[PDB]
């Protein structure tokens, strides 16, 4: 039937209130700062290396992805802020690599493009981290993976941090070997010069493409040949495109220039015989009834004041409709059913500290979402986990452990978004990074640490007051201020969205408004895989 009317969420905020004006101004300042930083990261290695990249007839890497995907298609870039002030004097825009999800010939493909304008396309340790993150996104979601190989050797003085470990560079080839055994098609397009470790990236591909007078593959370079043998050889005579397409047989297609290689890539993807099948149910899409500059005004920059998380769920779902589950029992957690772009979503959000009733409500809701095969969207705004003697007497530990067990055993596509603070073990309960969500984005006001700066400063102040009163010396106000400034300063600097997103702890600082669109894009890629049956472990009753 699906025809009767249903009430909807949402409250029109007081746009004249000075709290709204201050929250709106401060969040707008954060978003403008984000805008200008990503416009500086977009240029890449600078105009000198861009001139030397276009003087060899090479398309710039963002132009390569622009000519590769379907015309007019949205591209979802992942981890645009990697390597941001991560090395001391070495400015590495984008990590050196451009990874994202796009629509190629009607198929959602995962694209990995070596930016050669930034330090010769050399692999930094954060470049390997970003690449392995992209490859497990492609394996979780069953996305066909496209590599646009333009390398410059692994970096030498960071070689330890790139070479031997489990999640170091060689894992890349593991990821291409396993994904080929699962029918997830791997295409490599040699547009540059992979050398001596990176030459396995074209050689382990199910179907390969190379470019004449521009693309070289060899396991050993002309310096290594001139040192070990003494035979002078060039690059194109040693591992050029004519040699590889005609004699050795490493490359499978041959391309005149860059546009021909991207055209051939689209042909190879079109002949993959892939047909998308959704097992979830879809309703005709709709729109939120409230705009998202109101999310600028509602949420704001200060983490001291709380807000209602329902005013976020009114702004991001279809029709602003939301079936709230167990609405009065433990209202520091808001769990309900909504739809984004037709997809059914089970939305879990925070409203305060987590009592035991909140953890029981969360465990029940995650079990419902895994029994009905509904995806889960977690929204994190956490302060902590409700300290007190009575609550530890009640067994607040086993209830948080039940929520952690049900979140970790869940097989549905989970997506985390950190709309505020994310501190401590509550971060584990609300499906943080270590619990394998599909995607994890953050907002530019978020903070993430092991505790807040004030919590660390105040428990260290009380503990040192306790041990000095056992000692006997005078612990004054100035000693307390000299005790409290570096703890607050360190937890503020290292809790930033830019500190967390300089690594690949999160998949990217996103704008609040774009939040709605971004979630839809994320969920679309996550529905490219069939949904497995969830089986939980032992619930500690």
């Amino acid at each position: 039937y699906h025809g009767d009317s249903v009430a909807s969420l949402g409250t029109q905020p007081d746009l004249g209130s000075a709290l709204y004006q201050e929250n709106y101004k401060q969040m707008k300042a954060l978003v403008n700062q984000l805008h200008e930083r990503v416009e500086h990261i977009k240029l890449g290695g600078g105009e000198k290396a861009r001139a030397l990249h276009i003087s060899r007839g090479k398309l710039l890497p963002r132009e390569r992805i622009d000519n590769l995907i379907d015309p007019g298609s949205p591209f979802l870039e992942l981890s645009q802020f990697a390597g941001y002030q991560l090395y001391d004097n070495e400015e590495v825009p984008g990590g050196g690599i451009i990874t994202g999800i796009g629509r190629v010939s009607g198929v959602e493909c995962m694209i990995i493009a070596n930016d050669a304008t930034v330090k010769g396309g050399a692999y930094y340790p954060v470049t390997v981290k970003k690449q392995l993150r992209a490859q497990e996104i492609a394996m979780q979601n069953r996305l066909p993976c496209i590599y646009l190989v333009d390398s410059g050797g692994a970096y030498l003085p960071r070689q330890a941090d790139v070479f031997p470990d489990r999640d170091h560079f060689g894992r890349t080839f593991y990821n291409q070997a396993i994904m080929s055994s699962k029918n997830i098609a791997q295409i490599a397009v040699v547009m540059g010069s992979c050398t001596a470790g990176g030459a396995y990236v074209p050689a382990m591909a199910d179907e390969n493409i190379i470019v004449r007078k521009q693309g070289t593959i060899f396991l050993a370079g002309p310096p290594l040949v001139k040192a070990a043998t003494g035979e002078e050889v060039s690059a194109e005579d040693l591992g050029g495109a004519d040699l590889h397409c005609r004699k050795s047989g490493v490359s499978d297609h041959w391309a005149l220039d860059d546009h021909h290689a991207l055209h051939l890539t689209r042909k190879v993807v079109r002949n993959l015989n892939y047909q998308k099948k959704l097992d979830v149910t879809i309703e005709p899409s709709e729109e939120p009834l409230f705009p998202a500059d109101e999310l600028y005004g509602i949420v704001g920059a200060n983490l001291k004041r709380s807000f209602d998380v329902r005013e976020v769920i009114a702004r991001i779902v279809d029709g602003s409709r939301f079936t709230e589950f167990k609405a009065f029992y433990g209202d520091t957690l808001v769990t309900g059913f909504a739809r984004i772009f037709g997809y059914p979503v089970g939305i879990v959000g925070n409203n305060g500290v987590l009592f035991s009733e909140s953890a029981k409500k969360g465990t029940h809701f995650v079990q419902l979402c895994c029994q009905r095969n509904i995806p889960l969207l977690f929204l994190q705004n956490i302060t902590g986990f409700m300290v007190g003697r009575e609550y530890e007497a009640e067994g607040i530990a086993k209830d948080g452990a039940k929520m952690v067990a049900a979140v970790a055993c869940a097989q549905v596509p989970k997506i985390t978004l950190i709309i505020g603070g994310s501190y401590g073990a509550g971060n584990y309960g609300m499906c943080g990074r270590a619990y394998s969500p599909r995607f994890l984005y953050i907002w530019p006001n978020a903070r993430i640490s092991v505790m807040g700066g004030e919590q660390a400063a105040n428990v260290l102040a009380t503990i040192t007051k306790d041990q000095r009163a056992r000692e006997g010396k005078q612990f004054s106000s100035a000693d307390e201020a000299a005790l409290k400034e570096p703890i607050i300063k360190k937890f503020e600097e290292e809790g930033n969205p830019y500190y967390s997103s300089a690594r690949v702890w999160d998949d990217g600082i996103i704008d609040p408004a774009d939040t709605r669109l971004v979630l839809g894009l994320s969920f679309s890629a996550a529905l490219n895989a069939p949904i497995e049956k969830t089986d939980f472990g032992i619930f500690r009753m």
Partner: protein, 210 residues
């Protein structure tokens, strides 16, 4: 001034609503895998008994209850107050407009049927009648408690005041987290139980409405 609707006009409004619900059922079926199946026909066919639907239509200011019996042959028997009408009809389209074709006690008529949110519009050659569908309480409803155990910074209102819904009543800080209470309810405050600077506990009533 507005004139009251005739019982025949209420029959037409009730029939248009029933057929609109059928239309929604039919367009759901067109998207179903289980096509041609029973349950898709909004016939109201109970086993061994008849089905009577009791609906209420609001005619201006006054409510009228219409008992609609579903007959085996697709007709309806609508009893309004005491009088039973034999009501038949269907929908048809001409261009972009939907028309309701009626036959009530052998009297045929035709009117344009437009249903916009709550109001049923019937446009005929003798006039235009607006019949409203009543809205149930649970779709039109949309005191306060303390969120945690904290100390109150600023009170706002006293007795004799009046706030409207979505108003600041109190601000309380609980383990360094500023909580501004708001009003889902409405009216006038009769007593504020906690003055500013006192300690309120979990799920303790703050203000009251008499």
């Amino acid at each position: 001034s507005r004139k009251a609707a005739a019982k025949e006009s209420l029959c037409q409004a009730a029939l248009g609503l029933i057929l609109k619900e059928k239309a929604m059922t039919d367009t759901f079926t067109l998207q179903a895998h289980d096509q041609f199946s029973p349950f898709s026909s909004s016939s109201g066919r109970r086993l061994n008994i008849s089905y009577t639907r009791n609906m209420t239509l609001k005619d201006g200011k006054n409510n009228v209850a219409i008992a609609v019996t579903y007959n085996h042959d697709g007709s309806y028997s609508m009893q309004i107050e005491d009088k039973t009408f034999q009501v038949l009809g269907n929908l048809y389209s001409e261009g972009d407009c939907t028309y309701l074709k009626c036959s009530v006690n052998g009297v045929a008529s035709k009117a344009k049927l437009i249903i916009l949110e709550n109001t049923i519009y019937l446009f005929s050659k003798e006039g235009s009648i607006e019949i409203d569908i009543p809205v149930p309480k649970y779709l039109s409803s949309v005191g306060p408690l303390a969120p945690m155990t904290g100390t109150i910074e600023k009170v706002f209102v006293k007795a004799g005041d009046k706030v409207k819904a979505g108003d600041s009543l109190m601000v309380m800080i609980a383990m360094k987290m500023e909580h501004t209470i708001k009003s889902p309810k409405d009216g006038t405050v009769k007593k504020v139980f906690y003055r500013e600077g006192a300690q309120a506990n979990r799920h303790t009533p703050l203000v009251e409405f008499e």
